[PDB]
Amino acid sequence: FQTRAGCLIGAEHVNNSYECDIPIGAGICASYQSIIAYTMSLGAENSVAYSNNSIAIPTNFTISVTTEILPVSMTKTSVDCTMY
Amino acid sequence: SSTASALGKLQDVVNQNAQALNTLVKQLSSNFGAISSVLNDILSRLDPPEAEVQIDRLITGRLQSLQTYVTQQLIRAAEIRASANLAATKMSECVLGQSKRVDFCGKGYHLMSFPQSAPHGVVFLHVTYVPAHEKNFTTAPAICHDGKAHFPREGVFVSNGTDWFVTQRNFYEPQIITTDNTFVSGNCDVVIGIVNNTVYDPLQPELD
Amino acid sequence: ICGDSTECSNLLLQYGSFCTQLNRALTGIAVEQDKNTQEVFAQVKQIYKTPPIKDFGGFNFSQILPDPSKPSKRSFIEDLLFNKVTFNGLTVLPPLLTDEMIAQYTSALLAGTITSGWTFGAGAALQIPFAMQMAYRFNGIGVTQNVLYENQKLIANQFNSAIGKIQDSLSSTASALGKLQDVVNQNAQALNTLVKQLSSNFGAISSVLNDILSRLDPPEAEVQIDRLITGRLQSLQTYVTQQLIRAAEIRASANLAATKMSECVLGQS
Ligand SMILES: *[C@@H]1O[C@H](CO)[C@@H](O[C@@H]2O[C@H](CO)[C@@H](O)[C@H](O)[C@H]2NC(C)=O)[C@H](O)[C@H]1NC(C)=O
Ligand SMILES: *[C@@H]1O[C@H](CO)[C@@H](O[C@@H]2O[C@H](CO)[C@@H](O)[C@H](O)[C@H]2NC(C)=O)[C@H](O)[C@H]1NC(C)=O
Ligand SMILES: *[C@@H]1O[C@H](CO)[C@@H](O[C@@H]2O[C@H](CO)[C@@H](O)[C@H](O)[C@H]2NC(C)=O)[C@H](O)[C@H]1NC(C)=O
Ligand SMILES: *[C@@H]1O[C@H](CO)[C@@H](O[C@@H]2O[C@H](CO)[C@@H](O)[C@H](O)[C@H]2NC(C)=O)[C@H](O)[C@H]1NC(C)=O
Ligand SMILES: *[C@@H]1O[C@H](CO)[C@@H](O[C@@H]2O[C@H](CO)[C@@H](O)[C@H](O)[C@H]2NC(C)=O)[C@H](O)[C@H]1NC(C)=O
Ligand SMILES: *[C@@H]1O[C@H](CO)[C@@H](O[C@@H]2O[C@H](CO)[C@@H](O)[C@H](O)[C@H]2NC(C)=O)[C@H](O)[C@H]1NC(C)=O
Ligand SMILES: *[C@@H]1O[C@H](CO)[C@@H](O)[C@H](O)[C@H]1NC(C)=O
């Protein structure tokens, strides 16, 4: 297969489109089924029902708990010249 | 408990530091163009007036490697300091108070957060509110009554086909329209979208 | 450094691993660039679309929405912006996201914020007439919604005039995009000086390896080879360090842009 990133051997080009897991480049990437290369999809598409006299209001709710992890420090090291 | 690789960032930091140390210590086994890699051999094979050149080559090579290592350490330390400042701001704003800036801590409307200690970092648990189960309704921006225009004090006008209640903007809770949750401004001739209806008041029924 | 010379390769082989060390930095730079773009633009999950009929209370967004007639699917202002701006062992890799995908992300964000207000940034998009969203924002800045409804046409006209004026100013006056041009010029100049450094004696008798090999005996030519090797390696190291500094500053700017997109677009700040 020939693409803007280069030439790819060992994969089959398809006409579908799914999420991207192994990014190849130029907007294409590959996944395992065999191995298939395809054009990545940016997500599901919906058309919100706009009108000039209509709204939507929620009736229920949920409570969610999420995580985020941050590094704050690294190991303290020292080096002596003459020994090194 | 089960899923692994959930702490990729800390592992990446540790791996970077360990690999930098490993390559630094492995660089001690390079000739750098000299006749050997150990000082004792060149000392015990050649007379010093000619071995000093090889010693100089080893010295300059090792010094250059040390310089590169120190520069890389400085870069990484600067980045880590940036991350630590971000973490301090998050811990001050999302743990000691309820934050209003959208998406700063949590994907939704922020409620609270809890910290947990990690080997070289911190973990925040964010509690957020998410609406669900929405419904369609018809809407009007004002109500014309007795020639005047009424706007909601806080909420929005809706109707389930008829009856035109007022609600709050984030949770369906219809209520009858009274002169207590609305205010008047001008006549109903300039606004684009007003609808005819009635606005009840309690003083008249209380009168009799 | 060597340029297809076995003698140079053998001589360089006895410096240990400086080259895996160098490539491990450029790879990180490239991955960071891709992550920057992804975290700035991929703020949504679904691709929203504007309705075929466009009656936003008199506001006129036609200059900003995509034009299907144009093959690029970009908008007027995007086209103005794109037109306004301007092999020796070196490779340039394409970005993961092509320009059409970035345009699609921007279009999705913009249609979502036009139709659903700020609700689409928390949960699922909920529709709302545009004038009501304006009334909500006026209430947000401490002005009663009375004022908007009583002055809708004037506000719409002022907005349209402002957008026309900004389009005209961007179209006519140049030098308004100095920052991106500066970034491009800095990168190009760095590559240019790196490739020009290839023609320096560095204390040797010549700047080309073939003449060194084809004019002397290897036991004495290896000295000149060594001088050239160390000089070129020094230049490469300096280039890599400069690249690292520039990448750090670009990452800082990208983080600021991501926060601005999250706060001032998905909500009212
Ligand atoms: C709200 O009203 C709309 C208008 O009828 C309902 O129908 C959807 O309209 C949009 C826009 O035309 C379409 O994309 C959807 O496919 C329609 N729904 C269906 C089931 O066909 C809509 O279902 C109503 N409810 C909500 C939550 O939007
Ligand atoms: C709001 O959502 C919650 C959770 O989805 C609903 O609670 C569920 O109600 C069903 C039917 O009564 C039960 O079978 C589930 O066990 C309940 N779940 C929980 C966690 O208690 C609740 O009924 C919903 N309320 C409204 C008004 O829609
Ligand atoms: C809209 O909601 C209102 C408030 O619940 C409804 O008014 C009452 O609805 C109940 C349920 O059928 C009736 O038994 C009452 O007689 C209604 N009260 C009045 C004063 O009419 C109303 O029926 C709802 N309308 C629609 C179309 O759903
Ligand atoms: C909201 O949208 C409706 C479209 O349903 C508009 O109603 C149209 O108004 C024009 C001019 O008055 C008429 O020529 C059309 O026949 C109407 N459409 C229908 C289906 O009747 C309405 O004007 C818009 N604005 C408001 C404030 O309601
Ligand atoms: C709300 O009620 C008023 C009067 O109760 C309506 O105003 C009338 O409108 C018709 C049609 O435009 C005119 O022929 C009458 O002369 C008007 N009367 C008055 C006293 O103004 C008004 O049209 C109603 N609102 C709607 C949307 O129909
Ligand atoms: C929104 O503004 C655009 C201009 O930016 C309007 O399009 C122009 O309309 C006039 C009137 O016919 C034409 O002479 C121009 O050639 C149009 N410009 C372009 C680029 O097509 C557009 O009509 C406005 N929207 C509405 C609903 O009126
Ligand atoms: C499907 O893809 C193949 C190559 O992968 C191509 O030859 C063919 O035309 C495509 N068909 C459709 C309907 O897209």
Coordinates of C-alpha atoms in Angstrom, one line a residue, chain A residues 4-82:
Chain A
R4 CA 1.6 10.0 2.0
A5 CA 3.8 8.6 4.9
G6 CA 5.5 6.1 2.6
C7 CA 5.0 2.5 1.6
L8 CA 3.4 -0.2 3.8
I9 CA 3.9 -3.9 3.4
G10 CA 2.0 -6.6 5.4
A11 CA -1.3 -4.7 5.8
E12 CA -4.6 -4.6 3.9
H13 CA -6.3 -1.3 3.0
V14 CA -10.0 -1.1 3.8
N15 CA -12.8 1.4 3.2
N16 CA -14.2 1.5 6.7
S17 CA -13.1 3.8 9.5
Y18 CA -12.6 3.2 13.2
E19 CA -10.8 4.7 16.2
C20 CA -7.1 5.1 16.0
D21 CA -4.9 2.9 18.1
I22 CA -1.5 2.6 16.3
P23 CA -0.9 6.0 14.6
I24 CA 0.9 5.7 11.3
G25 CA 0.6 9.2 9.9
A26 CA -0.9 11.6 7.4
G27 CA -4.3 10.7 8.9
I28 CA -4.1 7.0 8.6
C29 CA -3.4 4.2 11.1
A30 CA -3.5 0.5 11.5
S31 CA -5.0 -2.2 13.8
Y32 CA -5.2 -5.9 14.3
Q33 CA -8.2 -8.0 13.3
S34 CA -4.9 -9.8 10.2
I35 CA -3.5 -6.3 10.2
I36 CA -5.6 -3.6 8.5
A37 CA -4.7 0.0 7.7
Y38 CA -7.4 2.7 7.4
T39 CA -8.3 6.4 7.7
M40 CA -9.0 7.3 11.3
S41 CA -12.4 8.5 12.3
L42 CA -12.8 11.6 14.5
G43 CA -15.9 10.3 16.2
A44 CA -19.6 9.7 15.9
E45 CA -21.6 12.4 14.1
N46 CA -24.9 13.8 15.3
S47 CA -27.0 16.7 14.2
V48 CA -28.5 18.6 17.2
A49 CA -32.2 19.5 16.7
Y50 CA -31.9 23.3 16.7
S51 CA -35.1 25.4 16.5
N52 CA -35.9 28.9 17.5
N53 CA -38.6 27.9 20.0
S54 CA -37.4 24.6 21.5
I55 CA -35.2 23.6 24.4
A56 CA -34.1 20.5 26.3
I57 CA -34.0 20.2 30.1
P58 CA -32.5 17.4 32.2
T59 CA -34.6 15.4 34.5
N60 CA -32.1 13.2 36.4
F61 CA -28.4 13.3 37.3
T62 CA -25.4 11.2 38.1
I63 CA -22.4 11.7 40.3
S64 CA -19.0 10.7 38.9
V65 CA -15.6 10.3 40.4
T66 CA -12.5 10.6 38.2
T67 CA -8.7 10.6 38.8
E68 CA -5.8 12.6 37.7
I69 CA -2.1 11.8 38.5
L70 CA 0.7 14.4 38.6
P71 CA 4.4 14.1 39.3
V72 CA 5.9 16.5 41.8
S73 CA 9.5 15.3 42.3
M74 CA 12.4 13.3 41.1
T75 CA 15.3 11.6 42.9
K76 CA 18.1 13.7 44.3
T77 CA 21.5 12.7 42.9
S78 CA 25.0 13.9 43.3
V79 CA 28.3 13.2 41.4
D80 CA 31.9 13.6 42.4
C81 CA 34.3 14.5 39.5
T82 CA 37.6 13.0 40.6

